[PDB]
Design a protein around this ligand. Structure first.
Ligand code: SF4
Ligand code: SF4
Length: 81
């Protein structure tokens, strides 16, 4: 999973880009819900929030380090099939 750091400028642009609805506005920055963040695996070749963030505030979350198989498994859980 990714996470949004303290560099977030609360610009809103990443929220509509997430295929899983993992991003929402928090207290002081936007926040990724890790159980919904597949790092876009299953939907896109790369993370869509990272592509749009203007200040590079979105990084790997080391407390939710996931393999590709885990991220694809999470995509399958979220979307069914
Ligand atoms: S990496 Fe993909 S799944 Fe994770 S929060 Fe960003 S847009 Fe959503
Ligand atoms: S795109 Fe980047 S700066 Fe804008 S709300 Fe999302 S994480 Fe924060």
């Amino acid at each position: 999973a990714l996470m949004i750091t303290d560099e977030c400028i609360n610009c809103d642009v990443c929220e509509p880009e997430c295929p899983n609805g993992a991003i929402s506005q928090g207290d002081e920055t936007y926040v990724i819900e890790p159980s919904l963040c597949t790092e876009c695996v299953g939907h896109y070749e790369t993370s869509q929030c990272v592509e749009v963030c203007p200040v590079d505030a979105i990084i790997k979350d080391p407390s939710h380090e996931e393999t590709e198989d885990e991220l694809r498994a999470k995509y399958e859980r979220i979307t069914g099939e």
